[model samples]
Target: TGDWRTATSLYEFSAPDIDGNMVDLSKYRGHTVIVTNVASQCGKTEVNYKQLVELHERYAERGLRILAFPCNQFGKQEPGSNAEIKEFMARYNVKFDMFAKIDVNGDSAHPLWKWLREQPNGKGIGGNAIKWNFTKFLIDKEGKVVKRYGPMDEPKVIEADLPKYF
Candidate 1:
């Protein structure tokens, strides 16, 4: 049941943090989480990064957690070593829990992401694809996906729905 392919829920995954520590995702249980694939050089980076940081600062104490995973799968936008990605996020004053760089599409994508894409997009259909960088998935306290957001959907848009789970 622990195997990623056959597993259910975000709890079944673990990913390396930017610090190179393999952190188990189940640790985030009982907390509402925002799992997003980020890129350092995308057109959406500036606004998303700032707003994501703001969301973290505003709601972290209320059991909100944002897990940012840097990805280069989109337009080669996030071409950076793990150390470089850490430095990049630092420039944005990003304080959320950041994981090591990983693919969010294709054969080598992260298992957590693969599972995330299979969830409903809250629009009455299965969200099996990640359109671009900054695709966000909201996970409820139980570690199940609540909704999926597209690249253009600013983080500000999510703020309104956060209280429902918090």
Candidate 2:
């Protein structure tokens, strides 16, 4: 096995944005990131999205970035295209990075997510597939998987942990 103490290198993958523009995760190098599998129509959408926006605003000045990936596998909640999702976030004054739609589990799951699920702390979560929308993976500046937050865990739960990485 590789050195467990070191963080994994950033993995690259390409996906089309809502408007068909390609997005590459590798562009976010050198930044602390919060990768969240989001759903637009889920009951937790309002709270989760708002809290994430707040988090981004709070730490953006310090180099903390939140990358939201729209996922429709859970409850078919995120049925909108990337453009629609972009509009919804704009209405909420969200300025964080919103990526294209992706599957967070199974064979079609995004490559980044598949690797994230293999991290040391991720093993206890039962499986490699995301349990639901809003499942979050936090990465340190070095691109190592640092923590995994569940759908029910609000953004506030991780606020205390943000400072150490910044």
Candidate 3:
């Protein structure tokens, strides 16, 4: 379980998809990935969800992958089962890959998220703690953490940073 503590890259992890299938991060090798902790009930939810789908539509064909993991860690904003989460996606017409809900903080945090939290933002603002839902980590084609965005940084705000990586 602590193996992710020693993992060097995003490819070193695996997580369950929304449907419960185990997905290896290696499958995303060579693709630019965005790993995000999401919530269906957050105040930021409506806009973030909409823009993420837009981001996916614009870049997924160019090897961009958005991985969404539902989390309820912030003010209990996402209290729903995997099934309910899926239904929530439908309301937003979400087409990007979504995964099973997992803790992005605390002892029971998912391994992938634990590792993500440990990475620096590379912009001098350093913190491992996730402040709220919609926190995103951008990964490059080589599966290295490139940058970290806070919950208030909407998906559209991340768009300008994508072209250079693509």
TM-score of 3: 0.93
lDDT tens per residue, model 2, 79-129: 987778888887678788778888877767766666677777544333466
C-alpha lDDT of candidate 3 relative to the true structure: 0.87
Across residues 1-166, which tens digit of lDDT does each residue of candidate 1 receive? Answer: 7645566689999999998999999999899999999999999999999999999999999999999999998999999999999998888888889999998777788878777877753231333778899999888998988878899999988998899888
Alpha-carbon local distance difference test for all models: 0.87, 0.77, 0.87
Candidate 1 whole-model C-alpha lDDT, 0 to 1: 0.87
TM-score (C-alpha) between model 1 and the true structure: 0.93
How many clashing residue pairs appear in each of the predictions shown? 0, 1, 0
Clashing pairs in 2: 18-82
| TM-score versus the correct structure, for each prediction | 0.93, 0.86, 0.93
| Model 1 spans with C-alpha error above 4 angstroms | 121-127
